[PDB]
Amino acid sequence: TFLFTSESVGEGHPDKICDQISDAVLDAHLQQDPDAKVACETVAKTGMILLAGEITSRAAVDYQKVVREAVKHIGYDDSSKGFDYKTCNVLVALEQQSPDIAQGVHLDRNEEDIGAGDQGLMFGYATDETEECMPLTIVLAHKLNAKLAELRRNGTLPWLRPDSKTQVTVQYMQDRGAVLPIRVHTIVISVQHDEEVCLDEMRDALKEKVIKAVVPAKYLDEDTIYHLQPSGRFVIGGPQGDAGLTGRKIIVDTYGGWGAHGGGAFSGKDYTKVDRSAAYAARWVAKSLVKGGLCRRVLVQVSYAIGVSHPLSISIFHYGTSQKSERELLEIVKKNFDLRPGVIVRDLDLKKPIYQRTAAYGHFGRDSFPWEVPKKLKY
Amino acid sequence: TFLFTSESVGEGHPDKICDQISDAVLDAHLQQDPDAKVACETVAKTGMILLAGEITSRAAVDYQKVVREAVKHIGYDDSSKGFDYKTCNVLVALEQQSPDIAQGVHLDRNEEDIGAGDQGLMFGYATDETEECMPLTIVLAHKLNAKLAELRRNGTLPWLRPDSKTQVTVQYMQDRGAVLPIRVHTIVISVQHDEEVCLDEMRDALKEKVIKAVVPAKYLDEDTIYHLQPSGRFVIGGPQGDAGLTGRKIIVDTYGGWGAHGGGAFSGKDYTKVDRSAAYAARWVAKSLVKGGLCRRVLVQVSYAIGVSHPLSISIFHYGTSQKSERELLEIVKKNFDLRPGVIVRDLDLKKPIYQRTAAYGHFGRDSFPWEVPKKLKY
Ligand SMILES: C[S@@+](CC[C@H](N)C(=O)[O-])C[C@H]1O[C@@H](n2cnc3c(N)ncnc32)[C@H](O)[C@@H]1O
Ligand SMILES: C[S@@+](CC[C@H](N)C(=O)[O-])C[C@H]1O[C@@H](n2cnc3c(N)ncnc32)[C@H](O)[C@@H]1O
Ligand SMILES: [K+]
Ligand SMILES: [K+]
Ligand SMILES: [K+]
Ligand SMILES: [K+]
Ligand SMILES: [Mg+2]
Ligand SMILES: [Mg+2]
Ligand SMILES: [Mg+2]
Ligand SMILES: [Mg+2]
C-alpha cells in the first residue's frame, strides 16, 4: 500500500477569492461581448482588491460592483470577519490586450484557425476510482470545504468564517496500474473562526458535523489521524491573514497532485488562453477514454506555441491500464478530437459566462460541465 | 516512443520578475535577521511593482532600493524597453505576520520542533537521463533562455530585450520505467525585441546563435520543427505586455511537468514555509536515491499540517526502476532524513541569503546548491 495526500481550500481562502473575482470579471465581460479577450489577475490583502491585466472588450463593466458582489457572495461582509465588501478598497490597473499579441493570435483570423493565445503545456487526467473519475483525495478535500461553507451559511456553526483549508491523506493499493482507495489515513481542517468559540467546541464540531457528514464511514477507523484546528487559533483570516493572488491554487483546481500540471492558471482567462481551454479539453479527452472503457486511468499532455492553432504535441500515458498501446489510444484521440482552441470553444461552449462557478471546489469532477460529459468515441 | 514538452521563461518574463523581486526582498531581510519570517508577494504591470504580504523581521530594508536594483539587474532600464527601474512606481502593502500564525507555528518553540508554517503537499523528483538528474526537456528550455540573456548582455544581439519564453518537446523511449531522450522534436522561442530588427534576422539568429549553441547536434535533425518568433512581433513586453505575479511559474521552477507538484510557490518565503523547504528537501532525497544507485527515476511526496513539525505522509514512487520495493526505499529514506522544517533548515543552510539566485532558470539541477549535493545513504 501507499499514501497519497491532496488539499483543497474554501471560498474565502485569499487566493481562491482572487480566482473567483477574476472569473466574475471574465463572466461580466462575456455576458455582453462573447468575444472579449480577458487576462484579469486579482490581488488581495487587508482591505484591498487590486485588478491588474489586460482586457479588450466591447462590454461596459462596473468593476466596483462586480468585485464587491463576489466578495459579498463569499461572505466577507463585516470588519469583524476581517474583510467587508461594502468598505474595502477596489483598485483597477487594467489596460487593453497588447496589439502585438492580438495581431499574432486572433486578428483577421477565421475562428476555427485562431492561434493559441500563448505557448505552454497542459495535462488532463482521469481515474476510475470514483464515479466522477477524480482522485478520492481531492474529492474528499473539496467536499470538506463545501460542508464548512454549508454549515456557515445555514447558521448551524455561526462561529465559522469563510477562509478554510483541508487536506486528506488516503491509503491506497495498486491493481495493474489502477489505484484502489482503502482508508483515510489523515485529515487536516483549519478554518477561520470568531473570537468566542473555544478550541474544544470547534474540534468536536469539525469531527462530528463536518468529517462524519462527508467521509463514508467505511474509510474512517480507529487509526485515522485528525489534525483539527492544528494551529490552535485562527481568528485573523482572509486577505488580512495572508495575501491572495489569482492562479495560486492550480493543483487544488485540478487533480490534487495526481496526474500532472503544465503550470498555467485558469481563472480570469478567456478561451483563447489554452492554459484553460486546452486543459479543459484534455480533461474531456481523459474522462472520455475512461468512461469509454479504454483505460482505467490516463494522463494526457498537449502543448501549444503562441499564434499556432494545432497542438505541437499530444501524449497519452495509461499507467498500464489498457490492453491497447498508448500509441493506439493516441490514434483514437487524434481521430475523435480537434484540439485547436477555435474548435474546443465550440465543443465545450467556452464563450458562456459560467466561469465564476468553476473557481472554487475544483474545475473538474462536478456539476456536469461540458468537459465532464464524455464524447462517444469511434474506433 | 512518446513526446514530452517542457517550457521555461527568461529573467524578464513578468512572472519571473516578481519571483526574483520577492526573493531579493527575502535575501535583504535574511542578510540582517536570519530568523526573519517572510511571505512577500510581488505584482507587476505597466510601470508598477507592488509588494504585498507579511514580514516580521528585525531588519531595516529599503524596499525602493531592493526592488529597483533587482529590476536593473534583469535589464529593464529605459522606457524604450517598456519598463525602467529608475522611474517605475514601487508600492508597498506589507504588514507583520499574523500573530495567530506566529503563535501556532514558531513562538516559544525550540527550532528543531518548529511547526510547519502551513499545511500542504510537496514533491521531489530525480531522473538519471542527465548528469544533473533533471529532465532533458526542462534543462534545454532553461539553457535557451540563459543563452538569450548572455547574447543580450554581451551585445551580440543588441535588439534582444529581457522578456523571453522557450519550449522544448523531446521524443523519448522508455527502458524499464527509466526514460531515454532520442531527439528534439519541436522548439519554440519567443523573445521581446526592438522596433528595428526584422523577423528574418531574428529567426536566423535564434536558430544559429541560440539553438545551435545550446542543443547538442545529435538531438537536432532534418525533421526538428522550429517555431521562432511565432507571433510575428513582440516589441511590447515585460509587465507592459502581461501582468506578472509571484508564484505563477511553479512548473518552470521545478521539473517542467515531469514528476508532480503540490501547488506551493517558492519565492518570497522563508524556511518555515514548507512549500519551499520541504520541496527542496524532497528534491535532495530524490537525487540522493538516484545518485546512490537505488533507482533510476523517483518521485517523493511529503505533506504537512500547520503547527506540526513532522510530515503527515511520505511516499516513494520508483516507476519500476529499482530492484528494492517502494516500501524498502521509504524505510531507507526514513532512516536517513529528518524532514521537520527545523532540521531541514540546518541540513540545507536555509537561513543563507541565496534565494534570488534560485528565482530564474529553475530551482533544481544547477550550481550545486545544498539540495543538489547528495546525502551518502546508510542501509
Ligand atoms: C498560513 S498562511 C500562509 C503563510 C503566511 N503568509 C505567513 O505570513 O506566515 C496560509 C493559509 O492558511 C490559512 N491560515 C491563515 N491563518 C491561519 C492560522 N492562524 N491557522 C491556520 N491556518 C491559517 C489561511 O487559509 C491562509 O490563507
Ligand atoms: C502572451 S502573454 C499572456 C496572454 C496575455 N495576458 C493577453 O493579454 O493575451 C504571455 C507571455 O508571453 C510573452 N509575450 C508577450 N507578448 C508576446 C508577443 N507579442 N508574442 C509572443 N510572446 C509574447 C511574454 O513572455 C508574456 O509574459
Ligand atoms: K495542466
Ligand atoms: K500569500
Ligand atoms: K511540490
Ligand atoms: K498574466
Ligand atoms: Mg497562497
Ligand atoms: Mg503560462
Ligand atoms: Mg503569467
Ligand atoms: Mg499552499
DSSP string, A313-377: EEEEE-TT--SS-HHHHHHHHHHH----HHHHHHHHTTTSS--GGGSSS-SSSSTT-GGGSPPPP
Is A203 domain-assigned?
Answer: yes
Q: Which long-range contacts (CB under 8 A, 24 or more apart) does B319-328 make?
A: B319/B177, B319/B178, B319/B295, B320/B176, B320/B177, B321/B176, B321/B177, B321/B178, B321/B295, B321/B296, B321/B297, B322/B294, B322/B295, B322/B296, B322/B298, B324/B294, B324/B295, B326/A2
From B100, B225, B301, residue closest to A234, measured CB to CB: B100
Per-residue burial over A176-212, b if 16 or more Cβ lie within 10 Å, else e, is eebbebebbbbbbbbbbbeeeeeeeebbebbbeebbe
Cα A300 to Cα A269, A330, A370: the distances in Å are 22, 9, 18
CB within 8 Å of A249: residues ≥ 6 apart: A9, A13, A15, A16, A19, B263
In sequence order, what are the beta bridge partners of B84? B77
| Cα–Cα distance for residue pair A317/A326, rounded to 1 Å | 6
Q: Structurally, how many domains does chain B consist of?
A: 1
Contact predicate A356/A20, CB 8 Å: yes
Q: How deeply is B154 buried, as exposed, middle or buried, from its count of CB atoms within 10 A (0-12, 13-18, 19+)?
A: exposed
In the numeric block, which cell numbers belong to residue B8?
Answer: 521555461
> Rounded to 5 degrees, what are φ and ψ at B360?
-145, 155
| A139, HSE (Cβ side, Cα atoms, 13 Å) | 20
Indicate yes or no: CB of B260 within 8 angstroms of CB of A257.
Answer: yes
> Residue type for A194, please?
D
Q: Is B54 annotated as a binding residue?
A: yes
Largest CA distance in chain A: 64
| Cα–Cα distance for residue pair B4/A68, rounded to 1 Å | 43
> Rounded to 5 degrees, what are φ and ψ at A46?
-40, 120
C-to-N gaps above 2.5 Å in chain A, after residues: none
Cα A261 to Cα A105, A251, B143: the distances in Å are 24, 7, 22
The alpha carbon of B202 is separated from its chain's Cα centroid by a whole number of angstroms, namely 28
In the numeric block, which cell numbers belong to residue A359?
Answer: 473557481
Helix count and strand count (H, E) for chain B: 9, 13
| Cα–Cα distance for residue pair B361/A291, rounded to 1 Å | 40
The DSSP secondary structure of A140-163, one letter per residue, reads HHHHHHHHHHHHHHTTSSTTEEEE
Q: Which run of H or of E encompasses A124?
A: strand A120-127
Is B174 domain-assigned?
Answer: yes
Q: Which run of H or of E encompasses A52?
A: strand A48-56
Contact predicate B305/B116, CB 8 Å: yes
Resolution in A: 1.2
| Cα–Cα distance for residue pair A213/B215, rounded to 1 Å | 56
Q: Which atom of ligand 1 is nearest to the CA of B38?
A: 8
Q: Which atom of ligand 1 is nearest to the CA of A165?
A: 25
Q: Is A8 annotated as a binding residue?
A: no
Contact predicate B95/A46, CB 8 Å: yes
Q: What is the domain extent for residue B169?
A: 2-8+135-237
| Cα–Cα distance for residue pair B170/A312, rounded to 1 Å | 11
| Cα–Cα distance for residue pair B244/B373, rounded to 1 Å | 32
Indicate yes or no: CB of A169 within 8 angstroms of CB of B312.
Answer: yes
In the numeric block, which cell numbers belong to residue B270?
Answer: 522563508
The residues of B annotated as belonging to the active site are 13, 15-16, 41, 54, 165, 234, 242-243, 248-249, 269, 273, 275
**Which of B25, B89, B121, B123 to mutate against chain A (most A CBs within 10 Å)?**
B121
Contact predicate B91/B28, CB 8 Å: no
Method by which the model was determined: X-ray
| Cα–Cα distance for residue pair B48/B62, rounded to 1 Å | 17
Per-residue burial over A318-337, b if 16 or more Cβ lie within 10 Å, else e, is bbebbebebeebbebbeebb
CB within 8 Å of B191: residues ≥ 6 apart: B10, B148, B160, B161, B163, B164, B165, B202, B206, B229, B234
In chain B the beta strands, taken as DSSP E runs, fall at 2-9, 37-45, 48-56, 77-78, 83-84, 89-95, 120-127, 160-175, 178-193, 225-228, 244-245, 297-304, 313-317
| Cα–Cα distance for residue pair B92/B41, rounded to 1 Å | 10
| Cα–Cα distance for residue pair B192/B8, rounded to 1 Å | 15
Is B201 domain-assigned?
Answer: yes
Residue among A342, A285, A363, A305 nearest A113 (CA): A342
Instruction: Supply the CATH number for residue B195's domain.
Output: 3.30.300.10
CB within 8 Å of B348: residues ≥ 6 apart: B277, B280, B281, B284, B370, B371
Cβ-based neighbour number of residue A158 at 10 Å: 11
Is B256 domain-assigned?
Answer: no
Q: What is the DSSP letter of A130?
A: S
Residue among B319, B58, B307, B323 nearest A319 (CA): B319
Please name the residue whose Cα sits nearest to atom 26 of ligand 2. Answer: B242
* Pairing mode of beta strands B160-175, B120-127: unpaired
Q: Which long-range contacts (CB under 8 A, 24 or more apart) does A248-251 make?
A: A248/A15, A248/A18, A248/B245, A248/B247, A248/B248, A248/B263, A248/B265, A249/A9, A249/A13, A249/A15, A249/A16, A249/A19, A249/B263, A250/B250, A250/B263, A251/A6, A251/A7, A251/B121, A251/B261, A251/B262, A251/B263
Cβ-based neighbour number of residue A156 at 10 Å: 11
Is A260 domain-assigned?
Answer: no
| Cα–Cα distance for residue pair A298/A254, rounded to 1 Å | 14
Contact predicate A146/A361, CB 8 Å: yes
Q: What residue has cell string 518552470?
A: B252
Q: What is the DSSP letter of B82?
A: T
In short, whether B117's Cβ falls inside 6 Å of ligand 1 is: yes
Of the bound ligands, which one is closest to the alpha carbon of residue A102? Answer: 2
| Cα–Cα distance for residue pair B75/B191, rounded to 1 Å | 14
Indicate yes or no: CB of B260 within 8 angstroms of CB of A258.
Answer: yes
> Residue type for A276, please?
R
Is B210 domain-assigned?
Answer: yes
Residue among B21, B12, B290, B257 nearest B135 (CA): B257
In short, whether A98's Cβ falls inside 6 Å of ligand 2 is: yes
Is B247 domain-assigned?
Answer: no
Is B31 domain-assigned?
Answer: no
Q: Say whether B160 sits in a helix, a strand or coil.
A: strand
Q: Which run of H or of E encompasses A49?
A: strand A48-56
Cα A312 to Cα A40, A318, A325, B203: the distances in Å are 26, 20, 21, 19
